[PDB]
């Protein structure tokens with residue numbers, strides 16, 4: 070069992086949970102591939118059986134009547150239909166465990182509080198749209214954000230897939246110009262061109278909220294314009310730098326991942342959007358300052374009158390900290406839930422300790438738990454971590470085109 | 471072959487060199503252990519040696535030649551006769567450079583070919599060892615214009631114990647367990663400090679007392695040697711616009727000189743081969759001064775800066791850390807001691823990656839050690855996927871000799 074050391078304190082633990090690793094990952098004794106983002110018939114019963122045993126142990130009901138019982142109906146359901154339906158409580162328990170198991174999520178101290186909307190009787194793109202709209206309004210909650218997930222019908226053979234084509238529920242547009250370069254978000258250029266292709270009237274701005282492309286099975290996608298009063302956004306200002314507001318920067322309140330695939334007990338939900346609240350460095354450091362994203366770092370440094378002529382003035386570092394300061398200040402002033410990377414990582418250290426006593430370990434992806442600014446200033450930096458795959462899980466999935 | 475993306479540009483390469491990785495690391499398809507700091511007969515000596523000679527003869531564009539097969543047969547005959555073999559001098563220079571080139575956690579490897587190799591394989595005693603080390607320090611420091619170098623002491627061999635430098639670096643500050651429970655000085659060096667005192671060193675009581683050297687000749691107890699103060703170049707730390715910073719009394723030393731790692735060349739082992747370069751400012755500014763278990767100055771700096779330390783969301787920690795790094799850079803530049811910042815360092819490592827892809831079809835890199843400890847995604851290496859694996863020649867960790 071792997072020895073895991075914390076270098077700030079000197080404490081040691083052993084990850085015994087690592088034994089249960091289902092889907093083998095990308096690494097071999099010959100080379101480590103841990104830094105790679107994407108690492109390149111009736112077996113349905115194996116995963117269903119084990120998931121059901123998970124559920125009943127977690128309610129202290131292993132080896133007792135209702136557990137014995139439930140094992141048989143899944144047997145008979147697959148015997149008859151080739152698949153099975155999840156009990157409500159199980160679907161809820163499975164959604165929370167997928168989150169709990171996500172190795173790259175630093176927010177997992179919250180995994181126990183998740184609102185699960187059952188949209189398994191969904192039947193059309195227009196139905197999806199109102200399901201998604203209930204979620205958003207519920208999650209957003211006038212800025213007192215509440216974690217939530219909506220689970221659309223599980224995939225079945227011979228029939229089309231429910232899919233959301235946008236990577237998130239809120240995405241800004243990305244437009245090319247008379248010179249190739251991009252106005253707006255360069256991460257969403259591809260999806261912006263799909264939305265225009267399917268009938269959307271493109272705006273002229275740098276923060277145009279894209280419309281949703283929702284895919285009912287075996288039909289094409291359909292464009293859905295989001296109600297603007299339902300997309301809560303935060304104009305960005307700085308507490309002491311009065312010109313920052315004039316830069317016109319904005320970001321949205323609800324981070325809502327709408328392209329990942331929920332797998333519970335061998336069942337696959339290709340449309341299962343989940344949402345929580347942002348950590349400030351996601352917006353301030355990655356979204357606004359990545360060179361391939363909004364790339365605002367030099368513009369803010371000019372306004373701060375910084376010496377951009379030498380890298381050793383650390384002008385980049387100074388401008389980045391102030392951009393994060395403005396994000397936190399803005400979200401707080403607008404009363405929108407947000408968490409800074411110091412509070413977030415301290416909470417994750419507490420999650421690690423809980424998980425050690427509860428399950429004997431915790432799958433964690435060091436490169437993604439450590440924040441993208443001030444890494445060694447947070448406690449997770451000095452914490453050794455073990456990465457592996459447990460089920461149920463959120464999985465990446467191909468684009469439906 | 472593993473495919474490797476640069477997420478900032480869209481670049482894609484394939485690490486074909488990883489397939490030749492001989493020795494194994496800690497990961498499996500079950501679980502990744504990349505974040506662990508310490509992830510760890512004549513026939514097998516023969517095959518390592520054979521592979522190294524092949525490497526050397528490739529480098530001098532003489533692969534397969536007369537001299538190449540001569541040297542292969544020579545080494546096997548010497549392994550048969552003596553159980554070991556001896557490197558020629560040029561083979562030792564080439565192997566020391568490759569060992570730096572192959573070090574996956576080193577961001578300064580653009581410089582790998584510019585390495586001064588001192589051959590001390592004739593060294594006889596701890597006293598001679600000390601003389602060689604002082605000459606190494608003098609040459610590398612070079613009055614603040616630092617030069618990369620390595621001194622190679624005699625190889626491990628059966629029948630005799632190893633040369634060992636007990637100190638983890640040639641320049642270290644003492645750490646004295648205090649009155650209450652605190653450490654005065656560098657807490658990372660409590661153990662080695664205690665070892666020096668128990669070997670007859672008279673301690674000081676400052677925060678920046680330079681430690682003596684404990685030097686081990688074969689089958690000898692370690693022997694204490696003091697470094698002449700004028701050999702150890704140091705830099706008082708000041709801040710360009712925070713004049714109270716000078717009153718903190720902080721200093722750091724010019725020469726980073728790792729002295730406790732094992733150099734492996736073609737199966738041969740050099741347990742004592744100290745090497746030195748120059749610092750990147752975040753090792754001093756972020757790790758050495760701001761780590762909670764090191765000098766831990768962050769809160770004191772932020773309080774002096776009049777930051778609000780009662781709430782995390784004011785980003786006082788980030789603000790104070792940026793200014794500590796400014797101070798380190800400004801102080802080394804003022805003092806005319808070589809130093810590189812994490813933006814320039816990570817950008818020349820990107821060129822290294824590119825040179826290495828052309829030269830060898832990839833480059834072993836340990837992402838979590840390459841990405842700087844502050845302002846990570848502001849540097850280009852953050853957005854570069856990397857493949858970590860073990861190539862030989864190599865610097866390896868080894869157990870402490872006590």
Ligand code: HEM
Nearest residue numbers: 168171173174175176179216218343344345346347348463
């Ligand atoms: C409640 C507060 C939450 C915070 C502060 C938070 C924060 C983060 C951050 C910073 C990442 C880094 C991934 C990246 O940069 O791409 C991440 C990943 C992830 N989170 Fe959370 N998250 C929260 C809630 C949730 C919820 C409710 C779920 C699911 C029910 C979830 C599931 C995931 C998954 C699957 C990933 C990996 C996705 C990827 O890396 O592409 N998180 N989270």
Ligand code: HEM
Nearest residue numbers: 570573575576577578581618619745746747748749750865
């Ligand atoms: C010339 C300037 C150099 C710079 C700027 C530099 C930079 C760095 C940095 C920042 C690290 C990681 C530090 C840490 O442990 O936190 C590192 C590690 C390392 N460097 Fe370099 N280095 C330089 C020269 C050299 C030389 C000359 C050698 C050997 C010939 C070398 C071999 C290594 C090795 C083996 C490691 C890994 C040690 C470990 O595991 O911590 N470096 N370097």
Ligand SMILES: CN(C)CCc1cc(F)c(F)c(CCc2cc(C(F)F)cc(N)n2)c1
Nearest residue numbers: 324325326343344345346347348351355356
């Ligand atoms: C890596 N970044 C820079 C690119 C954009 C990006 C790519 C992803 F794959 C991705 F999942 C995300 C959101 C992660 C996330 C998810 C959640 C949850 F509640 F929904 C909350 C939160 N705070 N963050 C963002």
Ligand SMILES: CN(C)CCc1cc(F)c(F)c(CCc2cc(C(F)F)cc(N)n2)c1
Nearest residue numbers: 578726727728745746747748749750753757
């Ligand atoms: C948390 N850190 C401090 C770990 C301690 C530590 C362990 C090591 F093995 C190690 F080599 C170092 C220095 C790396 C280094 C080496 C060199 C070279 F010229 F010698 C130059 C440079 N700039 N840096 C530090």
Ligand SMILES: C[C@H](O)[C@H](O)[C@H]1CNc2nc(N)[nH]c(=O)c2N1
Nearest residue numbers: 076450451452453505506838839
């Ligand atoms: C636990 C974690 O892997 C450990 O603290 C590592 C992370 N990355 C690092 N990177 C460098 N350059 N030096 C270090 O000491 C570390 N420490």
Ligand SMILES: C[C@H](O)[C@H](O)[C@H]1CNc2nc(N)[nH]c(=O)c2N1
Nearest residue numbers: 104105436437477852853854855
């Ligand atoms: C190459 C590297 O692994 C990759 O760019 C990762 C590193 N860690 C990350 N961590 C988060 N949270 N988001 C990211 O996009 C990345 N990028």
Ligand SMILES: [Cl-]
Nearest residue numbers: 324351352356
């Ligand atoms: Cl985002």
Ligand SMILES: [Cl-]
Nearest residue numbers: 726753754758
């Ligand atoms: Cl150091």
Ligand SMILES: [Gd]
Nearest residue numbers: 371372373374
């Ligand atoms: Gd001005």
Ligand SMILES: [Gd]
Nearest residue numbers: 710711712713
């Ligand atoms: Gd001043």
Ligand SMILES: [Zn+2]
Nearest residue numbers: 096101497502
């Ligand atoms: Zn790995």
